[PDB]
Amino acid sequence: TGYVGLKNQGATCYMNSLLQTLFFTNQLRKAVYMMPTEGDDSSKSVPLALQRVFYELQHSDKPVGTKKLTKSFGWETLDSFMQHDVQELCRVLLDNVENKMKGTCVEGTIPKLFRGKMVSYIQCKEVDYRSDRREDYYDIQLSIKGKKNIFESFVDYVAVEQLDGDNKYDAGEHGLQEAEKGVKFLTLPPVLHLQLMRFMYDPQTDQNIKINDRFEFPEQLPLDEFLQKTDPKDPANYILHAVLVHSGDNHGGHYVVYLNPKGDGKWCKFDDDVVSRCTKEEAIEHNYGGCTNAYMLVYIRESKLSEVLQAVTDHDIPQQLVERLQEEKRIEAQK
Amino acid sequence: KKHTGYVGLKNQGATCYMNSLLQTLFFTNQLRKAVYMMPTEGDDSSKSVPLALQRVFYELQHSDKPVGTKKLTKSFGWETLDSFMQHDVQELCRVLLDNVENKMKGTCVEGTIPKLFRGKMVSYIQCKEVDYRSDRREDYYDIQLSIKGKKNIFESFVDYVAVEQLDGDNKYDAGEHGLQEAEKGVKFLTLPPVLHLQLMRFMYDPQTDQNIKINDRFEFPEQLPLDEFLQKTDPKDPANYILHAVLVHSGDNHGGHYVVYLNPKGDGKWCKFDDDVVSRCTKEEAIEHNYGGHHCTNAYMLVYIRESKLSEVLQAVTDHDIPQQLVERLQEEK
């Protein structure tokens, strides 16, 4: 394979899958390498710990550990991962990286890669008043129940909700007014993170249940029809890059991530320390479900594929970062 | 029978339903005219779907030989059998029509796609044991009809607007309350002039193993009245439709044979478009012989046209409908 896996040092659940997905976001990895962490503390700095993990994944021939990384942002118990969905963990990592990039050239790199623009609108019917609420988004949670595939999920995602009964819109001064509620996509990020809503509740037993309904996702995803304004020369055509899967329908289950890091159709399976070649069928079709199925998908805009997946070489790692990390080994290599 | 005056599309490869869809849209004359008017002078030949569509339509109208679609497929992006098998026919039509509609913005043909294919529907989901109810309005350019256990298109529509119990799981995700048992209801506010109907013959067999094709018998009429399925019926424009084309598939699964039957003029004179081979056929071969065995060759999509809009939708198209700069550009490429 040529790629190195991550150690299983506890009940980190989806973390190892997320780290591999972000590590192969080459443009993000390069940005992480450029972070000025010379003065940061080794124990408390998430950006530094994140640099160490990416560095070891790129140079180490043995499984890479993540104890100091989890210890940096405080998720040191299985519970910590039970409290949050996968996207909320991705937010803690990206926000730690983005803050450290403030006051630099690479500032705003995370928003450029992951952030999208949408608007939540409420339009009155009898009277002329419209409330537009602009909101950035770094991920999209798709409803899969009764939905055949991503295409059908996006159609439902943009459905128009009606407010006309007792649930009339409180327009403040206008009081109660029949209105329509909806969401409109303004832009789609170069790297599209999609989460499938497979965790459900379930009031009778008062527990969260995973639904294993079949949900299909293509290798090529066209999303131009859902944008409010289309941009010629930059079509909203996306290419599948990673497939995060889970088995067991519980936090105590099995977590793995499938990736074609080069976006060339050559897929690999990342199962903790074991990285093995696999077919497109094992990575895609075998994860549609219908208890091992996909819960998160990563798509990359085709026009930005060369830039997002640009090759990262040793020259892209600052010497200061290398000297510090290698200095760290000498202390630990004292064994 | 072998000389019909119509040209076919070459069998480039595993484009699956593409050629059948293209012939469908080509004979939607009102749409074809709008495509000719799109301002494509500043378009890139290598990445412009609208220009590629103009090229295919132009060649289908003037060529004496099978027309190629490599430029269209190249610009579209789907160039593998695996790609088409991952998408339904309605998504291909949606991506194409939406791309052409964007191109028509700011022109005399702006909004042709929505006027011809866009209909509106309203649905509700009411929880049985919780005070949670959600009403929604939605635009649709196509309809997926269930055929399993359905005798004809009439029963399929009845099942479409029937109140379906959401029990089991199945259970409706009522946000804070759901999963919850609920009842779902859908109804048609309007029907578009051109009605695209997909028949759900490709279903996933769960172990079983993989998706299996449903060859059960499903009957569709030449004249389709859909007035009782609307929420409001108005005279002088009842929802009477005339079958315009029948997309059919033979074989099974990944490897299949695609054919489309069309009476382009809406006069009942049917023809069989089998890629480069086009030949006249009888109504029975286009309709009854596609109901499904009792086999391998049956319909998976139908195209009806509102009877009041028939003359307008199927308006005659002439060379004078093609701007000269478009003609000159295509003649230059040749």
Ligand SMILES: O=C(CCc1ccccc1)N1CCC(O)(Cn2cnc3cc(Cl)ccc3c2=O)CC1
């Ligand atoms: O690892 C787990 C717990 C076990 C699990 C794994 C995979 C699928 C279902 C359950 N999770 C991470 C992935 C996910 O976070 C996926 N996800 C994300 N956002 C959602 C938002 C809503 Cl509103 C409803 C469901 C989900 C959801 O399932 C669910 C919990």
Ligand SMILES: O=C(CCc1ccccc1)N1CCC(O)(Cn2cnc3cc(Cl)ccc3c2=O)CC1
């Ligand atoms: O060409 C193919 C694949 C081979 C094939 C062709 C015709 C009939 C069965 C299988 N397809 C295009 C037509 C279709 O896209 C029809 N269709 C459309 N929408 C559906 C929605 C649901 Cl929820 C379930 C089934 C279908 C469906 O079969 C199925 C795939």
